[PDB]
Amino acid sequence: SMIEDVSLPSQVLQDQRLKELNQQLQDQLAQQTPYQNTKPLQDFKHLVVEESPCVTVKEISLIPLIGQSESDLQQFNFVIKAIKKHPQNILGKCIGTQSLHNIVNYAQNELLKKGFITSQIVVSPQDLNHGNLNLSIQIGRLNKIVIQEGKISSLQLKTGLPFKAGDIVNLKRLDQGLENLKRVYAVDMQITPATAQKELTGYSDLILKLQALQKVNFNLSVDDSGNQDTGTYMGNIGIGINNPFHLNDILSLNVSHSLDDFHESLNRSYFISYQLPVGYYDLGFSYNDYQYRQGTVAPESGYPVIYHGNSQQANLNLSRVISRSGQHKTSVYGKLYHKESQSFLNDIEINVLHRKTSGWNLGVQHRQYLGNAVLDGSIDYRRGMGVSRAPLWSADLRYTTPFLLLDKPAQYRLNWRGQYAPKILVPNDRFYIGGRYSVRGFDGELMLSGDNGQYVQQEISLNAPIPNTQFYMAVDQGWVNGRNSIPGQRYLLGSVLGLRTYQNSFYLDAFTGRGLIAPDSIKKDWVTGFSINLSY
Ligand SMILES: CCCCCCCCOCCOCCOCCOCCO
């Protein structure tokens, strides 16, 4: 007997659409604007200079101020570490007033490097009488979080901000907490000195002005893509609920209906996503329900042959920011997933196509800023069971930058996704190319596939003379290789030209494309696509 999932095309397109949807929801979360706060005024190539009166330093130490425990100072030994590490070998040199000023400025830049923007390196110059350079730290702390405007529960502050009153002010934790609050608020954050009767000297007040974002958001989309003969028609209802349980949380709902004339299929899809932050951590869970019907409902033969089936997927996600700055953000994550799928023929179940799978994902993601350019990507390791240690490597890379093109503002965009499988994969685990999600300019009725694969999408958009409009041209490329692939059919090259416009909560995206290079079994026909969305 010949085993066959006649629905494999519709399920591949659903997975690609699911991945695109999850990326768009993650991209909706506002990040902190990039900056370069640790800006060296003077480069510190040479701190020691030849000076009129100087003292020979024989010890560089960090010395507690009044009321400072040495556990408080243990966190700041990197300041003295950096001093002693400097290739000018400060220890044993003759230090006058100008070099001492430079050594202090260097240790303060190092303080700002690690994010302590309200702390200050001071010198206790009395012990220089004995050749001892003794540094001290004015530890700047947080006195009060002040909500000048907007409502926020005490629990929201505790879970969204990884810091509390009385902690040491660090810009990495301020930015993290600010990003968590910007999921549900428009946020204004200011640092001011704390006042006592008329100041608290070592303390700061965090002034927050909050304005809640629209609680309920709707997105209705219709898409009509295909070739000049056949096409697919999609309808999407997206609902975004903002801060429903007052936990800086976001709940997303999506219902999709599709009519694919390429595979004479009808598809419905339900998707729910919940996400809440806990300081540097992030918790998420999602669920997808997918159903299809395939065949001719009223055939000429009088023998109706309908293939239909359902598929469910549940996911639990946990990620933690491990490193961040004004120009980068890095996090590690772990996923737990369970999948279940069954197929039918005229309401009779095909037993050998009943599939339950489960497994876990481990990965790391990074985002990097330089100027107005954004670079972000991830690498993922997956392992899943069946009914057997099937390892899958996944990777992602995206790059965006503005640039001038014939003296008009423009944007360049590159999307790259790659998959490497050491072992044989089942059909659904393969990497597919050709269609709106993998290589544009192809209709997707026939896709190339391999156990290993990668595509790179490239696109340039320029502003139209009309406001809130832009033209774009795109060139995409796909590659498949490894098992489940046959040579000579391993490459796709498509091109797309189109336009996009936004008219007062109405978004249009239309493109016409064609396949440039393809194996003989691929049509290289002309394709069109029209997308309309309404948010309110
Ligand atoms: C440590 C592994 C991280 C994940 C890497 C997966 C991306 C590797 O994809 C390889 C698939 O290549 C298919 C054919 O490639 C031909 C073109 O190659 C030129 C660019 O490498």
Residue numbers in the entry: 1 to 197, 199 to 388, 412 to 560
Pull verbatim passages from the article behind this deposition.
CdiB is an outer membrane transporter that releases its CdiA toxin to the cell surface. CdiB proteins are members of the Omp85 superfamily. Despite low sequence similarity (21% sequence identity), both structures adopt a common fold: an N-terminal α-helix (H1) is inserted into the lumen of the β-barrel and is connected by a ~ 20 residue linker to two periplasmic POTRA domains.
We determined two full-length crystal structures of CdiB transporters from Acinetobacter baumannii (strain ACICU) and E. coli (strain EC93), which will be referred to as CdiBAb and CdiBEc. CdiBAb and CdiBEc structures were built and refined to final resolutions of 2.4 Å and 2.6 Å, respectively. However, H1 is positioned very differently in CdiBAb and CdiBEc: the angle between H1 and the β-barrel is about 10° for CdiBAb, versus 25° for CdiBEc. In addition, H1 sits higher in the barrel pore in CdiBAb, positioning its N-terminus closer to the extracellular surface. In this orientation, H1 interacts with the inner barrel wall using 12 H-bonds and three salt bridges, with no interactions to loop 6, for a total buried surface area of 1263 Å2. In CdiBAb, the DxxG motif accounts for four residues on the 12-residue β1 strand, allowing β1 to form an extended β-sheet with β2, β3, and β16. As a result, the β-barrel is in a fully zipped conformation, stabilized by 10 H-bonds between strands β1 and β16. Extracellular loops 1–2 are short, with loop 2 curved inward and partially blocking the top of the channel. As a comparison, when loop 2 adopts an inward conformation in the CdiBAb X-ray structure, the sidechains point in the direction of H1 and loop 6, and the β-barrel lumen is partially capped. The equilibrium simulations demonstrate that CdiBAb interconverts between the two conformations, while CdiBEc stabilizes only the unfolded conformation.
